[PDB]
Amino acid sequence: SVKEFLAKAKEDFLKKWENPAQNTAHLDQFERIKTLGTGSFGRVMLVKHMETGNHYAMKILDKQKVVKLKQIEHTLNEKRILQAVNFPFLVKLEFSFKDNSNLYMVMEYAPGGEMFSHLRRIGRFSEPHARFYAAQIVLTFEYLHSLDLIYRDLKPENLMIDQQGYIKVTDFGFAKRVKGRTWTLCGTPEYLAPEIILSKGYNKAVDWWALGVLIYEMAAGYPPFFADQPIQIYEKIVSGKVRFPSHFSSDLKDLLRNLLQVDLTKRFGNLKNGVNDIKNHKWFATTDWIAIYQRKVEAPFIPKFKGPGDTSNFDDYEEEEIRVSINEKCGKEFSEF
């Protein structure tokens, strides 16, 4: 059903895109519990919806800090896109609202924690393990790209593991709906396509370059381009000569040579055959793409569970009180949120 869904999906997304849901909950409806992660101008907390008992992950963003770091349009992008999309491997936005000081996005909670945690701990994933995850990302990008959405921040830190061991892509902070090309220098250094670094203008093909980095990092335990400083990483990316671990299969290597491809006219995902150049690659020969979509494949790794509200798969973070000023801040800037 990786065809029938896409058709109905565009019509549904466009309606929500053009008429976004707004102000669908209030802060006092949630018991805040624990910080699950942190960002440039906020944090994500585990919360319990008191009325239903459900647990959620609440993203809290300081309006003033968003403005100061000129992320207003990016933040409006994030919420407008998240409220409009629907796909098995995307976190759900359940509620959103704002108060005098903050913006709130209440999302689905992924008890399995971040892929990043597991990947660093174990060192690296086997190729079948990496393939299982990578298949979900390919399907997700097929979906997003069908909607003229670019994602622009793929990395293990932004991929949650759910109770069944399947991926939930989170963190739509740099997502953008764009027909044609765009120019913002954004993303994470290790994952940036050369087009981005060279400020040439770029398109959805940067996400497929990022898929190449992700698969490399999953199977190797380290990314293809690393250094101590971003500029040194950028220098390696633009030079662009990837070298593979000796344990990489010939098939994996061929796939990565076609994803980590500087030439847009040759990069898989960006040819006339689109995503099927990837789906049909020999490395994915064993993958049942429909089974993956239907979540009927046995996950390689099911996280250690516990009664909802358990956060064993998360790092501990310094807790801070959520202050709400008696005066409204940046109201005009975030009018449509």
Binding site: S40, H74, D153, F174, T184, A220, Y222, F226, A227, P230
Partner: peptide
């Protein structure tokens, strides 16, 4: 080894985005 070089680097923890 490349792995040992990665582990000795300053970028084995969570990586910050850039913007823009």
């Amino acid at each position: 080894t490349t792995y040992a070089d990665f582990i000795a680097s300053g970028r084995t923890g969570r990586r910050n985005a850039i913007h823009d």
